[PDB]
Every structure is written in structure tokens, then in C-alpha cells.
Amino acid sequence: LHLGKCNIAGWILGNPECESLSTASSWSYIVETSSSDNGTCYPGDFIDYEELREQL
């Protein structure tokens, strides 16, 4: 699964700038980018965020 310019938090929450995306039915790893700034468009404290990146 490749998310492009968006990170995991832009995909698991439904960020509107990551609309052009075709999520497959199965994957093995998630790819982020170095310029992954279009994730959480609203700020906040993502509690237990590091464990969610390994579960999915």
C-alpha cells in the first residue's frame, strides 16, 4: 500500500487531500514520504499512535 504524499494519519482518519487513492484488499508494508505534511490537517495529540502504525 502506497499512500503517496500523505502519511498513515492522513489515511486512517480520511484527510481530504489524499482522496485520489485506491486502497487494496491486502498489503505487507506502508510507505510514507519525507514531505508527509498533509496528514493531520487538524492538530492534536495522537495517543497510542505508534502502536497503530504497526497493527495496520
Binding site: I12, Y29, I30, P43, Q55, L56
Partner: protein, 110 residues
């Protein structure tokens, strides 16, 4: 609010929600009309208590508020339970998953 969902699948169901933290007390009543709010998320394994704090945060991306995002797993046969009187971000879609890997930050094509 009082919602629930019975796991009718043979795999785990991932549920993501959010806890809204408004900036000022005038923004709390203008969006929810409730001062003392509390959010409850309860499963067969975990029962958490959420309490949003209303305070002035530094301006990040032209937003003086915060929103804490939480998550939990739902076992096959377990029924999730949501009960809140304000500042709850209800989910729209769920991620049914089943596993037995991490993250990669790169710019390589696919």
C-alpha cells in the same frame, strides 16, 4: 449519543474516533452547548474515560484547538459501546483486519 456494533465477521474490527479539545469556552457552547462533557468507550477488555480540556493552545496551522485521536480493537463476538454527551468524533468507516512489519519513509516509486 448511544451507539453500538456487534462483530458479525470472523476477524478483528478496528475503530478510530477522536476527542475534540476546543480553544475557548465560547467555542464549547457554540459547537456543543454543554459545559461538563465526558466520552466513554467500552469493550469486553477495555473501558476508558475521556475528558476534554478547554484551554488556549498555540496557533498551529491557523487552529487554536486540538483533537486527540484514539483507537481500539474489537474481537469477533465483542460488541463496542459508545456513550458521550459532547466532544465526540464518531466513526464513519471501520477497518476489518486479520494478521499473524512497520513504516517506510522514502520517495521511491511503485
Amino acid at each position: 449519543l448511544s451507539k453500538s456494533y456487534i462483530n458479525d465477521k470472523g476477524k478483528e474490527v478496528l475503530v478510530l474516533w477522536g476527542i475534540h479539545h476546543p480553544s475557548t469556552t465560547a467555542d464549547q457552547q457554540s459547537l456543543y452547548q454543554n459545559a461538563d462533557t465526558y466520552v466513554f468507550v467500552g469493550t469486553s477488555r477495555y473501558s476508558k474515560k475521556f475528558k476534554p480540556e478547554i484551554a488556549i493552545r498555540p496557533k498551529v496551522r491557523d487552529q487554536e484547538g486540538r483533537m486527540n485521536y484514539y483507537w481500539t480493537l474489537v474481537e469477533p463476538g465483542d460488541k463496542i459501546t459508545f456513550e458521550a454527551t459532547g466532544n465526540l468524533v464518531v466513526p464513519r468507516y471501520a477497518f476489518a483486519m486479520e494478521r499473524n512489519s512497520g513504516i517506510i519513509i522514502s520517495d521511491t516509486p511503485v
